[PDB]
């Protein structure tokens, strides 16, 4: 069945940066349109970046636009978020995370998720 | 701005039910795709269901099917979870959800979140 394993994350101070991986298997990340979504406590769900299935064009949420980039390797199929310029404010737990109707499979998957944090 | 406002939540006890509301400001329910999404205590999100499509066809957790309803009343642009047969397993903070796509690919959306505790 399908599955989406999230690493990377962890602990940093601002200006850092952090890349997280997620490792699909049981489909192709190519095939899907997939994400990531954040989650604070107070600021609920959040998508923080997209990429949509074929021509490989890219949503970002306004607050991360220049410093996070979402992108694939096909033959790993690994979906990533390169984390650049961190500020306190992104500290969330991050879902790799198919769109609410993917593909394939009738309801919507989630990674299990990755704390990212970010303080002096 | 699109908006989704959750209410309808709080404690029951287990055997009982409890409808989820999701007012939808800024766009219409009726077209668009939707959805809810549920964290337990400690664990991760998880799809609980959606409705979507051109014929309003509705999809559910393995876990909640036969228990849970989604619906949408479109007078009152208003999502709903009608939640019977309620578990310890339901215990969990609920965000509405939908995905709109005014440019050929889907843009997505979450409420606040409204805790449900089942004891």
């Known amino acids: 069945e399908v599955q989406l394993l999230e690493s990377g994350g962890g602990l940093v101070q601002p200006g850092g940066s952090l890349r997280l991986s997620c490792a699909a298997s049981g489909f192709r990340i190519s095939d899907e349109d997939m994400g990531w979504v954040r989650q604070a406590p107070g600021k609920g769900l959040e998508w923080?970046?997209?990429?949509?299935?074929?021509?490989?064009?890219?949503?970002?949420?306004d607050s991360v636009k220049g410093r996070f980039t979402i992108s694939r390797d096909n033959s790993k199929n690994t979906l990533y978020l390169q984390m650049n310029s961190l500020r306190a404010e992104d500290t969330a737990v991050?879902?790799?995370?198919?769109?609410?109707?993917?593909?394939?499979?009738?309801?919507?998957?989630?990674?299990?998720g990755t704390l990212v944090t970010v303080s002096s | 701005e699109v908006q989704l406002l959750e209410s309808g939540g709080g404690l029951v006890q287990p055997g009982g039910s409890l409808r989820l509301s999701c007012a939808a400001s800024g766009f219409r329910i009726s077209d668009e795709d939707m959805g809810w999404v549920r964290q337990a205590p400690g664990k991760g999100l998880e799809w609980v269901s959606s409705?979507?499509?051109?014929?309003?066809?509705?999809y559910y957790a393995d876990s909640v099917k036969g228990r849970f309803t989604i619906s949408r009343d479109n007078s009152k642009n208003t999502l709903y979870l009608q939640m019977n047969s309620l578990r310890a397993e339901d215990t969990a903070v609920y965000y509405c959800?939908?995905?709109?796509?005014?440019?050929?690919?889907?843009?997505?959306?979450w409420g606040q979140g409204t805790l449900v505790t089942v004891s």
């Open positions: 959800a939908s995905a709109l796509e005014p440019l050929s690919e889907p843009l997505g959306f």
């Open positions: 409705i979507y499509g051109p014929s309003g066809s509705t």
